[PDB]
Amino acid sequence: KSPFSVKVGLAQMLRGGVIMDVVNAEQARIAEEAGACAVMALERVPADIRAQGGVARMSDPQMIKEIKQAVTIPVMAKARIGHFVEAQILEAIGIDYIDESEVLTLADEDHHINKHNFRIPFVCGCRNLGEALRRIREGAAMIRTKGEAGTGNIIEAVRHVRSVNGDIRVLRNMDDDEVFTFAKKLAAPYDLVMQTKQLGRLPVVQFAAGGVATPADAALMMQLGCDGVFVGSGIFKSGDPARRARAIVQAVTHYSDPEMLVEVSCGLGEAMVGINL
């Protein structure tokens, strides 16, 4: 198996999981104790990046090391889009995944990181199938929806999931002779388009992200065909994070069980208020 396949295989172990944003070791422990499949180490949640502005960069390696030592589940961290040196540093710290993330301040407007130059697997965002496939061709081993970051509004995530999955379904029964033109119109590599056609799904793990605020939101993403979910702001910017954390984890595990969804949602305290754009 190729080095890319190995990275793809590693991310498959996250299936059925919730990845939680954490700003310190206590939060990392709460996330792990609630049953998160991984933590995403950062110095500012997307809701605070949105509200405060400023330039948002890779976190101090010291804070990332503190998180990595506090838990036994995988640790991810964010690098700015195109900032291949930030990614070099992260990889050298010994974390498990890099998220080349649009919630940080864009560092390169025209090019993403060449992810094939790394041993560590990367996650990238997308809003549509063409974007997902372009990120994979650059070497992303996992894809998430961009959703809308820091608002608690699931609308954009739903749009992106339906866009990606919808185009995958179109591709499945398409006349093979029309696939060349479809690849052109997606601006995506033809070989990856054909692989997606043969598989009937994205050739890497696909998670939802952006605006998941409630257990209902998380389960909705799973019922729409995601492999798992990222939660950022939605937890520690809520009234009771440990309980809310557990509730989201349970919602993802038991996504097709309305009785369970009722139980975990019942009396959950204040959700993040967020912002309607």
Tell me if residue 78 is catalytic. Answer: yes
- Which residue in 16, 276, 19, 22 sits closest to 154, CA to CA? 276
CA distances from 167 to 22, 77, 154, 193, 206 (A): 33, 30, 20, 10, 14
CB 157 within 8 A of CB 234: no
Query: Is 232 assigned a ligand-binding role in the annotation?
Result: yes
Judged by beta carbon distances under 5 to 8 A according to partner kind, the member of Cl ion, its own copies, none in contact with residue 6 is: none
Q: What gap in Å lies between CA 221 and CA 127, rounded to an integer?
A: 15
Using alpha carbons, list the distances in angstroms from residue 254 to 201, 260, 271. Answer: 22, 7, 20
Residue whose CB is nearest to Cl ion in the complex, by number:
189
Q: For its own copies, which is the closer residue by CB, 32 or 95?
A: 95
Quick one: which segment of 50-58, 69-77, 88-96, 189-197 binds Cl ion (CB under 5 A)?
189-197
Residues 88 to 107 in contact with Cl ion, rule: CB under 5 A: 105-106
- Give, as ranges, the residues between 239 and 268 that touch its own copies (CB under 8 A): 258-259, 261-262, 265-268
Q: Which 10-49 positions form the footprint of its own copies (CB under 8 A)?
A: none
Q: Which is nearer to Cl ion, 54 or 267 (CB)?
A: 54
Among 267, 274, 273, smallest CA distance to 247 is for 267
Q: Return d(Cα 193, Cα 188) in angstroms, integer.
A: 7
Site for its own copies in 50-69 (CB under 8 A): 53-58, 60-62, 65
Q: What are the angstrom distances between the C-alpha of 155 and each of 46, 152, 218, 231?
A: 16, 9, 13, 15
Is residue 233 annotated as involved in ligand binding? yes
C-beta closer to its own copies: residue 35 or 61: 61
CB 270 within 8 A of CB 239: yes
Residue 174 touching its own copies (CB under 8 A): yes
Is 147 annotated as belonging to a binding site? no
- Between residue 124 and residue 153, which ones bind its own copies under the rule CB under 8 A? 134, 137-138, 151-153
Exactly one of 78, 115, 146, 237 is catalytic; which is it? 78
Q: Which residues of 185-213 are buried (b: 16+ CB within 10 A; e: fewer)?
A: ebebeeebbeebbeeeebbbbbbbbbbbb
Residue 191 touching Cl ion (CB under 5 A): yes
Binding site partner of 4, from its own copies, Cl ion, none, Cβ cut-off 5-8 A by kind: none
Residue among 262 and 275 whose Cβ is closer to Cl ion: 275
130 assigned binding-site residue: no
Q: Would you name the residues annotated as active-site residues?
A: 78
Give contact residues for Cl ion (rule: CB under 5 A). Answer: 105-106, 189-191
